[PDB]
Amino acid sequence: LAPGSSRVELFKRQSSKVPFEKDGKVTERVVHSFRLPALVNVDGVMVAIADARYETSFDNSLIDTVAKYSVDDGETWETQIAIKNSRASSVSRVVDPTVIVKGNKLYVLVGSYNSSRSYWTSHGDARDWDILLAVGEVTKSTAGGKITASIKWGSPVSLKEFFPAEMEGMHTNQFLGGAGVAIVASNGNLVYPVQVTNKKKQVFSKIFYSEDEGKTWKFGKGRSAFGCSEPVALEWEGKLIINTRVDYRRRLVYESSDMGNTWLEAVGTLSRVWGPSPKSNQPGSQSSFTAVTIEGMRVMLFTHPLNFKGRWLRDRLNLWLTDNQRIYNVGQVSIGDENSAYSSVLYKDDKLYCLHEINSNEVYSLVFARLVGELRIIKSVLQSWKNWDSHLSSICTPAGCGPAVTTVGLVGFLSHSATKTEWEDAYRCVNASTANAERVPNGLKFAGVGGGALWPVSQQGQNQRYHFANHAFTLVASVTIHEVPKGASPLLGASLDSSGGKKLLGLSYDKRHQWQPIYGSTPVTPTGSWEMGKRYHVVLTMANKIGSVYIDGEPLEGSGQTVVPDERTPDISHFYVGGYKRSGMPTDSRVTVNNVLLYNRQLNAEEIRTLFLSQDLIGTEAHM
């Protein structure tokens, strides 16, 4: 982790002690491993909840739920056991503690097991399982001229009575919380995203919520796909966003406007973006996923390990920042190549913290980190986002003023800034690589075999921030052709393969001064007319499997065709700009490209016409 940042080993493996209560007797007991961090703020007191695995890190062993709390931002802590297991056997355990804060109360939901030695999803029945809720009340005193906190943990109550034997077809077996930190919805509901099994041993996610302060609970009727576990959720613009774990696959993300009655995959923003390993073929993880306000902008924070080592090692814990449009990698929170899987991020009084695991030889500690550097970076990126959105929106468009340039769904913008080999994203998330490029105001001039710029889509590798483009996009640019080509040459497009030979949608230009719009695999029909040196406005749109190509605000003749067979979903390799950037491709595009914009939707007619009219006003050169 970053410059200026620091940590301590707070929950220390084989060292920290907790008050182990059995049969009315308490003994300070050393704990082998601590896992499943949840870090929250209750009325100014920081509270950290986790598993205390007494003798071993094996999942199916002796576990109580431990809590530490601090009134001085983590400088000093008191320690308690928030929830004890049944003591029925040497493997009795309360597990996957999931926390909600409302007023001065901490709602903690745990699974409770008595004697099984096997993993929960493997169970053929529910005989060893219960689902419990404990409430902790947090009070503060200023006696003695100091702040003293205390937390009184009530007895756990079983919520089993609220679990229906049947759901939309299936028969239910067990459920648990998704671990970490859940929420109170804007309407006051307590909301836990939960992981549920059926008699087929399939796992799936749902919304489990209470409209009466936790006295009664209900299930939404919809669900995730099968295979989605450990769900984590936040509320964004009136809707729940449910971020799920999928072992051996990319993470799936869903939105619901009705407490889980209906679930829609968020294909246009966050779903399938985050991979659980470099090859997305290893176990997933628990993730922190919260909505916060920083310097007045509403955003989301998300953590997940990169897992270069594989299996459940889960090294290299990374933190991400997004506004539901752009997706920025803040960086690695953990240190070196240490194993570091589960985590919890907290933003309190304009300070950022992380409670996370470190794992050596299957012995786990939780470190408590002060993310000083990470918050500095975050605030710089958010400033950049605000500044450019402000710039675009402040432009008085050719009428007094016409309609504003749209920033809604604007994800990336290539304009004046660039280096010898990169065209820089003004929004700072994804740069394009270049070859044979010369800098010019608000863009690049390209020439020669192998020339052009490449804006990676699936090529981003593990984490694919532009996976929305396989469902809808609008890509815009101003282009100027300097030489008549020998035969069709490319200007702009979306490629389905690494070379650019198989295109989803694109535009090329030919020796007869015609345009060559390319609609999927359809045979190309040249059309319209172009002139050398003239600056043209180009827009490619794709939505609902149909692509269109506009020139100067006007649809090329024949635009509006099918570019995706309704069976399949595309896997776009990259966008190419100003050529293919492939030496293996024989084309030589001699062109200047300025002001490339990528939106995560199909722009409408008015929007398209406004961008056309304000071409010469949107560049970044004059304002840095």
Q: Which is nearer to ligand DAN, 343 or 602 (CB)?
A: 343
Block residue for tokens 């509901």? 189
Minimum CB distance to ligand DAN smaller for 179 or for 346: 179
Cβ-based nearer residue to ligand DAN, 37 or 456:
37
Q: How far apart are CA 69 and CA 104, in angstroms?
A: 13
We find the least distance from the C-beta atom of residue 93 to ligand DAN, in angstroms, to be 8
Q: How far is the CB of 61 from ligand DAN (least distance, A)?
A: 10
Q: Which is nearer to ligand DAN, 152 or 201 (CB)?
A: 201
> Is the distance from CB of 549 to CB of 539 less than 8 angstroms?
yes
| Single-letter code of the amino acid located at 76 | T
Least Å from the CB of residue 313 to ligand DAN? 11
Residue type, 45: V
Which residue number, 236 or 312, has a Cβ lying nearer to ligand DAN?
312
- Please state, in angstroms and as integers, the Cα–Cα distance from residue 265 to each residue in 224, 612, 618, following that order: 8, 33, 33
* Integer angstrom CA distances of residue 36 from 15, 276, 308, 367: 18, 18, 21, 12
Least distance between ligand DAN and beta carbon 18 (Å):
18
User: Token pair for residue 510?
Assistant: 């030919």
The DSSP element (H or E) to which 372 belongs, if any, is helix 372-394
Q: How far is the CB of 317 from ligand DAN (least distance, A)?
A: 13
CB of residue 254 vs ligand DAN: minimum separation in angstroms? 17
Contacts of 469 (CB under 8 A, 6+ apart): 457, 494, 542, 572, 575, 598, 600
CB nearer to ligand DAN: pick between 251 and 416 = 251
| Shortest separation between residue 580's beta carbon and ligand DAN, angstroms | 42
CB of 148 to ligand DAN, least distance (A): 34
CB of 269 to ligand DAN, least distance (A): 25
CA distance 157 to 163: 14
Run of H or E including 589: none
**Residue 134 or 179 with smaller CB distance to ligand DAN:** 179
Q: Are 354 and 343 in contact (CB under 8 A)?
A: yes
Q: Which is nearer to ligand DAN, 92 or 195 (CB)?
A: 195
Task: Take residue 82 and report the two structure tokens written for it.
Answer: 């928030």
> In angstroms, what is the minimal distance from the CB of 312 to ligand DAN?
6
Q: What is the CA radius of gyration of the chain?
A: 27
Asked if 32 and 11 count as a contact pair (C-beta separation under 8 A), the reply is no
Question: What CA–CA distance (Å, rounded) separates 520 from 561?
Answer: 9
Query: Minimum distance between the CB of residue 350 and ligand DAN, rounded to whole angstroms?
Result: 32
- Which is nearer to ligand DAN, 341 or 542 (by Cβ)? 341
- The burial class, CB within 10 Å (0-12 / 13-18 / 19+), for 161 is exposed
Nearer to ligand DAN among residue 276 and residue 520 (C-beta)? 276
Query: What is the rounded distance in angstroms from the CA atom of residue 484 to the CA atom of residue 509?
Result: 9
Q: Which is nearer to ligand DAN, 120 or 536 (CB)?
A: 120
Q: Which residues bind ligand DAN (CB under 6 A)?
A: 59, 95-96, 119-121, 179, 195, 229-230, 312, 341
Dihedrals phi, psi of 621, to nearest 5 degrees: -50, -50
CA distance 590 to 481: 6
Query: What's the CA gap between 113 and 94, in Å, rounded?
Result: 6
Is the Cβ of residue 88 or residue 408 nearer to ligand DAN in the bound state?
88
3-state helix, strand, coil in the chain (%, to 5): 10, 45, 45
Strand pairing of 591-599 and 515-519? unpaired
Minimum Å gap between C-beta 213 and ligand DAN is: 26
**Minimal distance, residue 334 CB to ligand DAN, in Å:** 15
SS3 222: coil
Give Cα separations from 161 to 136, 165, 235, 535, 563 (angstroms).
Answer: 22, 10, 27, 69, 51
Half-sphere exposure of 100 (CA within 13 A, CB side): 27
Task: Name which of 111 and 619 has its Cβ closer to ligand DAN.
Answer: 111
